[PDB]
YECBM32 (Yersinia enterocolitica), 139 residues
Amino acid sequence: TAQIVAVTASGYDSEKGHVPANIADGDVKTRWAASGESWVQLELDKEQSIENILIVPFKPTERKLKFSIFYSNDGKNWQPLAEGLETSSADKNGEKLTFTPVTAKYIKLDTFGTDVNNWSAINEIAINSAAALPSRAIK
Ligand SMILES: [Ca+2]
């Protein structure tokens, strides 16, 4: 997948150590988590063509995450890839979201908690992932 060099977030669960970098560590056992309307932003090594993102939400079969995905080349001006998504509860293991390729250095998920409570929690995110996971077109 595309190399993430930096992760930042609106906030995180500091008591439990659910830090932003947890989203990029290739470890499904760790997670970023934050409460209320939140965001996590991934910075790629370079500006490049993007065509999918893989998201492995926390407890995906019990909780659907609401979120929107934005992209930028400058970290200040954002365009939506899609707004008002929910993750799949049918997918144990994560899903890939595909779209019309765009050029981006940054990807930001604005997150709105789940259908269960106001925590947004994500185990993994990857950009241009080749994982064998199911697979849904957005916007
Ligand atoms: Ca992780």
In short: The chain has no helices and eight strands. The chain has one domain: 1-139.
